[PDB]
């Protein structure tokens, strides 16, 4: 009925465990994410196996449902993908095809609409997190390049299933992928990205949605957010300096808390500096991620060191009048995954883990 715009966030100062979806304790999926419309949240995932291949699909269930075969809806063939709601209808994004000649497909509602072709003739990938719609214009991060080497990203502006504009970010673009994006304000989409080869510092994208321009710089903060990591504050040189332990990586969580006079930036990180174990929640209020070296504050442990952390993502729940920022965690077990959701709610400290 109406287009969605980002709204100010619901009051609160901390996160608490909200919900755990753990289908194996009673369909094998990976890289889950959550996307929400005005009155509906969906839990999306890619199938990994049956209850990069020709059989992987983008599937979903209502958030709160266990993602069984009977409950799941198969939206499209996809070894990589994302989804979002523009206030009127669901947009589903997926990538399929050959590693060196992959293609993006866009589905709107029930129909297939536009496609996008690989540009670096390497595995085309999308953000594996939900896409961001403002006024009907959905901004999707895509990337195409080497797993190890250069992989420049670009953004697609998608309107009613069609790709209307290609946005080519400037700045430090040598390797950007698996971006967790959200609105900082009505004018800006910010993303905390993976760098799978050069550094443990996440590229931080600032996309201007009034001008359709973007610039990427590494986060300057001493607390490094990727999985392989130097031991906090150990990377020397200016903010843009690449550090050690840059080979490999993980998609992290990232949400914004939009307050009338402030932007809170909530980030997630693993507990281990080398292995994908545990998850913690970190926060910084205000500042500029591209210049501010200040360590992120530690809010608390979301997943203990003894449990798998793996991928995380940001999403927001539409609470009638305000938005609720949430960070989800993909707990991979043996390789299906459980999804743990932590949401901003109330005040005080994060009190318990998953």
């Amino acid at each position: 009925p109406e287009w969605t715009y980002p709204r100010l966030s619901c009051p609160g100062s901390t996160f608490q465990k909200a919900l755990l979806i753990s289908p194996h304790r009673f369909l094998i999926i990976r890289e889950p994410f959550v996307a929400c419309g005005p009155n509906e949240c969906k839990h999306f995932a890619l199938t990994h196996y049956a209850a990069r291949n020709k059989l992987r699909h983008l599937i979903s269930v209502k958030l709160g449902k266990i993602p069984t075969v009977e409950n799941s809806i198969f939206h499209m063939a996809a070894w990589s993908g994302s989804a979002c709601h523009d206030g009127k209808e669901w947009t589903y994004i997926g990538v399929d095809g050959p590693d060196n000649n992959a293609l993006l497909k866009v589905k709107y509602g029930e129909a297939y609409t536009d496609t996008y072709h690989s540009y670096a003739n390497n595995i085309l990938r999308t953000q594996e997190s939900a896409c961001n719609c403002i006024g009907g214009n959905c901004y999707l991060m895509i990337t195409d390049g080497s797993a190890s080497g250069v992989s420049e990203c670009r953004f697609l502006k998608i309107r009613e299933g069609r790709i209307i504009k290609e946005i080519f970010p400037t700045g430090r673009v040598k390797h950007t992928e698996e971006c967790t994006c959200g609105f900082a304000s009505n004018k800006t989409i910010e993303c905390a990205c993976r760098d799978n080869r050069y550094t443990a510092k996440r590229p931080f994208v600032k996309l201007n949605v009034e001008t359709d321009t973007a610039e990427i710089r590494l986060m300057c903060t001493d607390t490094y957010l990727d999985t392989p990591r130097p031991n906090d504050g150990s990377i020397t040189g200016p903010c843009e300096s690449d550090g050690d332990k840059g080979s490999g990586g993980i998609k992290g969580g990232f949400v914004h808390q939009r307050m009338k006079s402030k932007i809170g930036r909530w980030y997630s990180r693993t507990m281990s500096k080398t292995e994908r174990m545990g998850m913690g929640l970190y926060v910084k209020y205000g500042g500029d991620p591209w210049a501010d070296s200040d360590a992120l504050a530690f809010s608390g442990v979301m997943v203990p060191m003894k449990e798998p952390g793996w991928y995380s993502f940001g999403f927001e729940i539409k609470d009638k009048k305000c938005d609720v920022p949430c960070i989800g965690i993909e707990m991979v077990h043996d390789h299906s995954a459980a999804t743990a959701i932590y949401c901003l709610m109330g005040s005080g400290q994060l009190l318990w883990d998953t």
Partner: antibody
Amino acid sequence: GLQLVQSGAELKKPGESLKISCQGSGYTFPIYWIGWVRQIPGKGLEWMGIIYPGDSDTRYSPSFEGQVTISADKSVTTAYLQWSSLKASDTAMYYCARHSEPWYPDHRFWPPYPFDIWGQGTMVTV
Amino acid sequence: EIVLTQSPGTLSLSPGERATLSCRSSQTVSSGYLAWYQQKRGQAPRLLIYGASSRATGIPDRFSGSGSGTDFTLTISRLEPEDFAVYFCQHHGTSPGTFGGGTKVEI
């Protein structure tokens, strides 16, 4: 207490099959690659291949492709090197070694890592 | 595809002397991924250097090893009886790992 423990020694006849192994301890075995390295006593080291216990993803040096089999079983935290037709010339020391950093399938790259820990080596005659 | 020809192949330096060991690659070593290992008689080799010149944990400052392109060295700032071993160079990039013949360091 980080280690790779190998079997002691074997002596075989030409044509007699052979399996030797390494047991890992002190690390998260299913996320690190374990390689096999051959050393004929008067020669240098020769990378034979690597395995990723965890999904048993293997890579072989072209010169050992089809000559040996590399396998692993995360259940007992072990890695194996097998021959079907042990010829002679396999009179070498065989070592396991684990890569310095963990790897996950979604990294999508070939582990560009050195071998950080080595087993003591298994001596195989013939 | 990548061949490492480590040389001279034998050093005959006394303790207290600086030892330079070379490793010439037949083609450029991408990203500088050339490791060095120390093999003492009767035992599995120890990792000294990884990346073109990063020092492995537990390795003394005696071992440096700067290098780039196709031309890499291992430098032992001062030899000690402890470091008379056969040294090996290894390509450890995103391709089948491959070692050199090895250089023996004698008194």
